[model samples]
Structures are given as C-alpha cells and as structure tokens.
Target: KVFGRCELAAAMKRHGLDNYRGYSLGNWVCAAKFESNFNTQATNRNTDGSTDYGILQINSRWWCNDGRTPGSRNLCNIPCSALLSSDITASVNCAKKIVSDGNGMNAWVAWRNRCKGTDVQAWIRGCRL
Candidate 1:
C-alpha cells in the first residue's frame, strides 16, 4: 500500500495516468487482489510446490515458459517479476498490454470511452483530473 500511494504516483506521473484508464488506482489494487489474493510472495504449487503457475496459483512448469520465450514473452506475456520490479507502473502497464491490448483495442479510444456514463457507479467512477 505504501508503494501504491507514493512510488506508484510518481510512476504514474512519469508514465502518464492515461496509460491506465479503465479504473482508479484503488480498482487496480482490487484487480491485483483478485488476481493474486494480495500475496506478493504467493506462489502456487503442483501437488507439492514443485510446479508454480498462474498468478502464483498456477504451475509455471506446465503453464508459462513451457513452450514460450522468457520475460514478458511468456504465454501470459507478463513476467511475474514485474510485481517485484522497482517500476510498479511499468509492471502494471505490461500486464495491461498483454491482457487487454493483446486483442488490439485502441488504448486511447478505450480510455475515452471509460469516462462515458460512469457517474452512476459512484465508487467505481474515478474522478477525472
């Protein structure tokens, strides 16, 4: 949480907030929770911690780096180490690009659409700056 408030802010400023537009910073944290249950050190095991996979819940031996290249080049296209990297925003951006833009949506246009009719969802709507 400390990094989210401080480091992430500077990263966002440098990387530009527009890079992450679909949700608020809080929502991004929520997304991380849903993805990894907030356990940064979390790692999934295959029967006996031999195989690690899927957002730490998956076995890397069977899922990622199995046939694909290393780094963000894995099948998920997101390196788990991104979560530990010094640049958190860059990590999130890498994941965002892999998971969302993998299908080829125009980020800027999608961002523009994110603000439309959002007031109805009070907590979900991030105030535009």
Candidate 2:
C-alpha cells in the first residue's frame, strides 16, 4: 500500500499531479481510490489476456509490458513491475501520458464509473498540505 486518501492527495499535489493534463487532484485521487485503494502493488488480470497495473490500473494492452502478456503495445515503454511499487514516479508519469494521449481521466474506467461528477473534495479534506 502507498498512501491513505489525505496523504495521497498531498503526494499527488507534490508530484504536480493535482492539476495536470486537464485532470484535477480530486479526479485522480478519487479514481485511485477505486482502482487500487491506493495500493501500489495492485494488479488484475483481464479476461482478454491483458493485465492492469498500479493505482491507476493502467492496462497492458496499450501501456506497460508485464512479460507474460503478449501483444502489448507498451506505449509507456516501461515494465509493468515498475508500477507495482511504493514509489509512484513511473506510474504517475505513465498516467500523465495516458491522459494526454487519451480522454483525460476518462481513460480510466474506474474514474468514469465512480469519481465522475462526484464530490471528491473529501479526498483532500483535513490534509495539512
């Protein structure tokens, strides 16, 4: 696990993720909560033979390479293992590229399903940032 909501909001802010690629801190944080509950080592194997990586649940189909998954586009050009760690530098950078290349936070289904149009200010509430 990486951070709780408050700490994650602060960390994302520190990483310049609070406002990047037209996505807000609340947007990213709320998405992360649903995707992995801020767990850095999160991974889920999809029925289509691809896997999702990290807090953002980035897909191997177009992003990172997870070795066992064949035919990965690997657009992020990084190992999927890099995302399954406490350090989020790789994951954050890759997420930025995903949002920039795709449809902002809409790239993440979790974000679209849960965080979209929700009151996510609670993600940063009481944080001494």
Candidate 3:
C-alpha cells in the first residue's frame, strides 16, 4: 500500500502482473492508480450495495465477499479483507483469476472508463520495471 510508482512496477513485475493475461503493465498501472491510488487497503462502497476491494478494486458481488453484500457468489473463495493487505499475494492471485474469467481488464470499471483507450505509457514512465 502507498507504494511509489517504481516500487509498484517492481512489485507487479515480481508478481508476474506485468502483461499477465495479455494486458499491459501500463494498463494495470493506470487501473491501480485510478482504483486505489496504490493503497492496498482501499475500499469503496457502490450504490448498488456492493463493495470494491484492495488496489485492484475487486468487487464483492461476485469475486470476494465482505459478508454484508447479499448474494455474493464469492467465486474467488477468499475474504474481501484478504485483498487489503500489503503482502498483495491474495489480491494478485484473485486479479489473475478475474482476468481469466473472461472480463479481462474490462472487469474493472475504472479500467474501462479511464485507461481503456488512453495512452497508459505514462503511468509507468521512468518506473523502468
């Protein structure tokens, strides 16, 4: 959480997130910035009564369960709080599952709204991962 850009890029590379699932590191970096500003413990409640979790902002409706959202499928089989850790092991694994589940980066609204068509190269500029 609260990592500098280069720190995040290095962590992502170490975790194999850079270009994992055919998405660019730029896309992941942009999405992470918009979604959580690099804060691992970040959470946001949606008007639809679901919550977003962690840096990648995985949702409670289907992926993770916060125990408050009704009908949560908990497809990731991990608690939502598990994503809010500095370790990032669980969050990264779940994010890979999300990308493989057919949505790709499209699973995150922030990615679609902010990073979809933009030149995301600047997000990792000088990070040199």
Candidate 4:
C-alpha cells in the first residue's frame, strides 16, 4: 500500500498547493528525487520483501513502533493511506514546521540559496504541473 510519486503529487496539490506553489512542489519533488528517484512505492527489501521501506523512502526501523498494532502494516497509523488525507492543513502546517518551523519562507530561501542555478525553485513554481 505504498504511495507512488504521482499519488504523492496529487496529494500535495490537494493539500492547498497551487499545482505550482512558487517552489514547494519542485522542492519536494527534487528532494524526493534526490532521496528516492520519484519511486514512491520504492522500497529496500531485506528479507524477501518482508522488510519493506517506503517513501520519502522511510525505513521500517524508523516508522514501526511499539504503539503499532500487531500484524498491522499501516505505517500511517490509520491505514496504508495517502499522507494527504482530510488533514490537508495539518500536512501543510507540518511541512512548514519541518522545513521552516519558525519561518517557512526562510526554509525556501535557504534551499534556493543552496541549490542555486538548479531552477528547482522555479520548477516547483511553474513547471511541475
């Protein structure tokens, strides 16, 4: 039940992004590309696929927890659901917290500064439809 890149993109767009959010989508896509090559369902199999790691390519070691239900593989704690559920605002807000926290714009600015000449920001803003 791992989500795919296309599915993730749809979710981000639904979560208040403007199909092109000036820089968010492109940044996310580029980041994911750097991490996982856009393969949302991409996983690293350790033991015949029993040990699966899904995207942003998070690992089971990182996601699985004692609170997790027995025999349940729902990384989402609800189900194998999309990250962008009805919790759109929460998603955006959390993204702000993770990358920006105190200042969301600052995170963007920092990324642009580091990734200079990459056009990742512009791509997020305009080309990632």
Candidate 5:
C-alpha cells in the first residue's frame, strides 16, 4: 500500500513515531518518503546479503529475520514480511526500535541527508497532526 505525505504522517503519529525517542514526527515521515515513497510493500535487496522492507524500510541485516540472512540478528524479533503489511503497525514499532537501540535516526541515510538538521516541519505541513 502507498500513502500520501499527510496520510502517512497521520498514521505514523497514531503509532507513536511522533516525537518518538526525541526525534520529531517529520524525521520519520521524511525518511519514509525518501526510503520508500510511502509504499508499504517496498523492498530492497542489499549487497550485504540482507534486504530492506516496508515503508520505513526496516533492514533484515539486524532488524528482522527473513529466514535467509546468514546469522540474522532479528533485533525486532519479527519476520521481515511483517514490515510489508499495509497496517504499518509493525513498521512503526520496528522503526522505533531502530531508534531506541541507539542506532539513531541516521540508520536511515535519507533521514541524515534529508531530515536531520533540515526544516523537518515541512514534512508534516497541512497534516494538522
């Protein structure tokens, strides 16, 4: 499933990405936009023998187990397929873990280059959430 900017922000806000772990809602929204363009089914194959999954693009390298990654960490202790659900609850939850684990928002290159130290408020503009 895909979502508009405001629509994505609203869903994420409800699931606790808003001001989560000291990062503003915009940070998450912006990262998602660049990472997957709000496409919940988005997936990317990485050279590291792992893949990125879903709207927030959770990584199988250390976040989820695809049952294929060699020695997967599964830090979120979930299957990578969970991140592809349109529901997005698992996506938000896992993204939160990615942050709270002290990996920082920089775990997403999009966040570091597009949201961090930028005018992130623009990401939530007109959302009213």
Candidate 6:
C-alpha cells in the first residue's frame, strides 16, 4: 500500500512515533517518504548482499533476517518478509528498536540528506493535530 503523506503521518503518530527519540513525527514521515514513498512493499538490496525492507526500509544487515544476508543479527527478530506487509506493526516496532539501538535517525541516509535540521513540520504540514 502506498500511503499518502498525511495518511503516513497519521499511521506513524498512531504508533507513537511523534517524538520517539527527539525526532518528530515529520522526521519519520520524511524519511519514509524518501525510503519507500510510503509503500509497504518496498525493498532495497544493498551492495553488501543485505536488503532494506518495508516502509521504513529497515535493513537486513543488522535488523531483520532475510536468510541470505550473511551474519545477519536479526535483531528485530523478525523475518524480512514481515516488513513487507501492509500492516506496519512489525515495521513500526522494529523502527523503534532501530532508533533506540542504532544511530538515531541517521541510520537512514535519506533522513540526513533531506530531513535533518530542516523544517520537518512540512512533511506533516497539511496535517492537523
């Protein structure tokens, strides 16, 4: 499912991503926008043979287990396929784990390039609280 901007914002907010790690909901919204354009089925294969999965583009390198990524930690304890579902519960929860254990939102190159230090509120501009 390809979520519209506001819809994605609503979903992320519903899952308590508003300020999970001092990063606003818009930070998440912006990252997801570039990572997968809010498409739940998105995937990106890395040069290291691991793949990024789902809406949040959680990587297989250290997060989910894709069975082909050598030395995968499966830290999310979830199969990479789980990240492909339209239901983003696993994706959202895994993202929290990523932010908490990983390098904040800097985990996503997309976030740093486009969202960091900018007015992320624009990502959720038309969105009403």
All candidates: CA RMSD (Å): 8.2, 1.1, 1.1, 7.9, 0.9, 1.0
Number of clashes recorded per candidate: 8, 0, 0, 1, 0, 0
> What lDDT score is found at residue 1 in candidate 1?
27
Q: Write the per-residue lDDT of candidate 4 for residues 1-129, one digit (tens) a residue.
A: 333555556566666553333545656655545544554445453443333323343323323322333453433332222322333333343343335334433333334454535766544443333
Models ranked on lDDT: 6, 5, 3, 2, 4, 1
Question: Mind giving the per-residue lDDT tens digits that candidate 1 earns over 2-97?
Answer: 233333334444554333545444334333334444444444434533433222133343224433323323444444444444445434454455
* Higher-TM-score candidate of 4 and 6: 6
| Native-to-model Cα distance after best TM-score fit, residue 35 in candidate 4, in Å | 1.7
Cα lDDT tens digits for candidate 2, 1-129: 778888878778888898797677889889999999899998898999999999889999889988878889999999999999888888889988999985878888888999889887877778876
Tell me the deviation in Å of residue 59 in model 5: 0.6
lDDT of 2: 0.87
Shift of residue 23 alpha carbon in model 4, Å? 7.4
TM-score of each: 0.38, 0.94, 0.94, 0.40, 0.96, 0.96
Cα displacement (angstroms), candidate 3, residue 42, comes to 0.8
Candidate 4 error regions (>4 Å): 1-10, 16-23, 45-52, 65-118, 125-129
- Show model 6 residue runs off by greater than 4 Å: none
- Any runs in candidate 1 off by more than 4 Å, and if so which? 1-21, 37-39, 45-79, 102-129
Query: For this target, which candidate reaches the highest lDDT against the unseen true structure?
Result: 6
In model 5, what is the error at residue 88, expressed in angstroms? 0.7
Clashing pairs in 5: none
Q: Write the per-residue lDDT of candidate 5 for residues 9-126, one digit (tens) a residue.
A: 9998999888988888988888999999999999999998899999988999899999999988999999999999989999888888888877799899888887789898899998
Better of 2 and 6 by TM-score: 6
lDDT against true structure, model 1: 0.39
